[PDB]
Amino acid sequence: GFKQDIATIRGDLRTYAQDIFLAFLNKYPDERRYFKNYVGKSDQELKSMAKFGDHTEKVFNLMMEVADRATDCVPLASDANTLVQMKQHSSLTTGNFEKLFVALVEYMRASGQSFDSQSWDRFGKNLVSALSSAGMK
């Protein structure tokens, strides 16, 4: 289930983080505009950039902390607010987050692995609700 999925992802966090993030950019190529340092770079080029691995891992680490603190895929309002208030997220809208979770769920369903994809979809929906409540446009 969802708790096991957190363990699966955490076990190889950097690989899953990179693969899901690339799935996101591949599904929604226009989203690359928010990452000026990743524009015009192949996947292998990206993987050779210190910040790509470091930042992508740290994003997914925080995602997993939020997921683990949730009750029945309902995240803490405080966690949503952290995400809204981050300077790095100042120009984002809930639609950016919606897209990330659509891509994440698609990745899980396409994987040969037994992720609880329905729960990740619902977690994403609940997180979007919480972001909106915390003031994200």
Ligand X SMILES: Oc1ccc(Br)cc1
- Contacted by 62, from its own copies, ligand X, ligand HEM, none: CB < 5 to 8 Å by type: ligand HEM
* Alpha-carbon span 5 to 44, nearest angstrom: 26
Own/partner long-range contacts of 16-19 (Cβ < 8 Å, ≥24 apart)? 16/60, 17/56, 17/57, 17/59, 17/60, 17/61, 18/46, 18/47, 18/52, 18/53, 18/56, 19/107
Closer residue to ligand HEM in complex, CB, 48/88: 88
Pair 130, 85: CB distance under 8 Å: no
Shortest reach from residue 118's CB to its own copies, in Å: 7
Closer residue to ligand HEM in complex, CB, 32/111: 32
- Contacted by 90, from ligand HEM, its own copies, ligand X, none: CB < 5 to 8 Å by type: none
- Contacted by 63, from ligand X, ligand HEM, its own copies, none: CB < 5 to 8 Å by type: ligand HEM
Helix (H) or strand (E) holding 133: helix 117-133
Which spans of this chain sit near ligand HEM (rule: CB under 6 A)?
31, 34-35, 54-55, 58-59, 62-63, 83, 88-89, 92, 96-97, 100
